[PDB]
């Protein structure tokens, strides 16, 4: 009835898509014969539905990880793979751009930085 996700992550792609087909054909055949005496078949349907979700999650996570391996050198990630954050956080200046300073300003900080001192009583 239920399939643990621990067995799900170990298998490869063709084993997933065969098992997903096996759960889906089973799920369809239940509801045809679940309309009469919906007892333990209804509990099986709930367990069949949850196992379908766990299988569909592993296929998507494996496909998304394969995409992120493919685009590891390219600079234009697809929109579905980019981080969400917020809207305003995505238009903020970069950490290196906002830390960038002029050459005149760096010259004054190099040669006259803030010192460390104290005043006695």
């Amino acid at each position: 009835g239920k399939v643990k996700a621990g067995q799900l992550w170990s298998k490869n792609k063709e084993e997933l898509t065969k098992i997903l087909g096996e759960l889906k054909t089973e799920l369809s055949q239940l509801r045809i014969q679940k309309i009469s005496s919906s007892g333990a078949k209804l509990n099986k349907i709930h367990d069949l539905r949850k196992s379908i979700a766990r299988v569909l999650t592993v296929i998507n996570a494996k496909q998304r990880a394969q995409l992120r391996l493919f685009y590891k050198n390219k600079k234009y990630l697809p929109l579905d793979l980019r981080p969400k954050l917020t809207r305003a956080l995505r238009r903020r200046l970069s950490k290196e751009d906002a830390s960038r300073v002029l050459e005149k300003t760096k010259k004054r900080l190099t040669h006259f930085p803030q010192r460390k001192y104290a005043v006695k009583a």
Binding site: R115, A118, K120
Partner: protein, 117 residues
């Protein structure tokens, strides 16, 4: 003088004890960053403008360039050792000059400086 809507624009001050705690925490937060340094920068001794307050004397904004050079403090070093510098003010008399280059000389005696790296 209640011709306009003074009901909509009345401000109480029940945060008076709470703002004092924040202000004292801001001074403690500042002193955590500047741990051996004093919190406030050094300021010059200046005379109050008008005829009413000519006899009184207060702290100004920053030291004049002639005051810094007479004391022996370079201009570009003074903001980095706690001395505020005012380019707008002028000296205009030897009494304003001598009082402040005594103050900066007294600052240097009580100042301990640590090397860069």
């Amino acid at each position: 003088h209640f011709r306009k809507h003074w009901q909509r624009r009345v401000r109480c001050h029940f945060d008076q004890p709470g703002k004092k705690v924040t202000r004292r925490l801001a001074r403690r937060a500042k002193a955590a960053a500047l741990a051996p340094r004093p919190v406030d920068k050094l300021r010059p001794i200046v005379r109050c403008p008008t005829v009413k307050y000519n006899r009184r004397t207060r702290l100004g904004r920053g030291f004049t360039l002639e005051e810094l050079k007479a004391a022996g403090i370079p201009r570009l070093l003074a903001p980095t050792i706690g001395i505020a510098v005012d380019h707008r003010r002028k000296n205009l008399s030897e009494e304003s000059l001598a009082a402040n280059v005594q103050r900066l000389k007294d600052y240097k005696a009580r100042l301990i400086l640590f090397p860069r790296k």
